DNA sequence: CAGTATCCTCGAGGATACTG
DNA sequence: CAGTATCCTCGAGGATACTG
C-alpha cells in the first residue's frame, strides 16, 4: 500500500493521507456527485491542474482503492474513472466538510 | 485571516486548510476529548513534536478561531489552550474521520 | 485521448541552543 | 513553563517537453 511506510498517531491521519492531496477532494467530489468521467472530462472540470499531477492524484487514489479505473481498447483511447464502494463511503465526510466550510466562510468574511 | 492569500475550488478545501496541518488533528482531538491543556502538557501528549512547531500550529489554529489561548500572569508561566465553539463544531468531522480511518486500517490489511 | 519523461522550486516542517 | 532565534531538510507539487 501507499501508507506502508507512514507512521500515524491517529487513524484520522490515515483518512487525511487518503484525501489530503492537493486536488483529491475536488476529484472525488466530481466523481461522487456526477458519476463516471473520462480523463479529459476531469481535466476540463479542473482547468488549473496539470496533466502529470491529475494522473498522479488519480493513481494514488486508485492505489488507495478509492477510485476505479477502466481502460477500453478503442481508438481514440478511452479511460473512465469512478468511485469504488469505499470511495462512496468517503462522501459523507466530504459533505460534512463542505457544509462546515460554508458555515466557516460566513463568519470570517462578514 | 490566514486564508486571505489563498484560493479554493471548494469549501471543503477550506476545512482542510484549517485541520490539515501536520499535527493539528491530534491537538484538536486532545483538546476536544480531554479538555484544556497547557503548552507543556500538550508537548507531553505529543512527544515527537518540537516546541517551535507546536506553538506554530497553535497560533494558526488560534488565528483560525478554532483554539482559545489563555495566558496567566503567574510564575512559572501558565498558558492554557482549549477549543472555542467553532473548534467543538469540528469534532463530528474528526470523529467521522477516526471511524473511517480504523475501518480502512482493518480492510487494507486483510 | 490519455497518457510519459525530466528537472526543479518553495515553503511546511524540524534540530538545537538559548531565554523572559 | 512557554516559548524564540538560527539554520536546515526534503518531497509534494509543478514546469516543460514528448507520444503510443
Ligand atoms: Mg489543567
Ligand atoms: Mg524530455
Numbering used by the authors:
A (entry chain A), B (entry chain B): 2 to 111
Copied sentences from the primary study:
The crystal structure of wild-type HxlR without DNA and FA treatment (HxlR-WT) was also solved to 2.6-Å resolution. Both FA-treated and -untreated HxlR adopt an overall topology similar to the previously reported MarR/DUF24 family proteins that bind DNA in a dimeric form, with each monomer consisting of dimerization domain (helices α1 and α5) and winged helix-turn-helix (wHTH) DNA-binding domain (helices α2, α3, α4, and β-strands). Our study on the FA-sensing transcription factor HxlR revealed that FA induced a specific intrahelical crosslinking reaction between residues Cys11 and Lys13. The resulting methylene bridge (Cys-CH2-Lys) on HxlR’s helix α1 caused unwinding and rotation of its N-terminus (“N-terminal helix-flipping”) that allosterically rotated its DNA-binding domain with enhanced DNA affinity and transcriptional activation. Taken together, we confirmed that HxlR uses a gain-of-function, intrahelical crosslinking mechanism between its N-terminal residues Cys11 and Lys13 to sense FA and trigger the transcriptional responses.
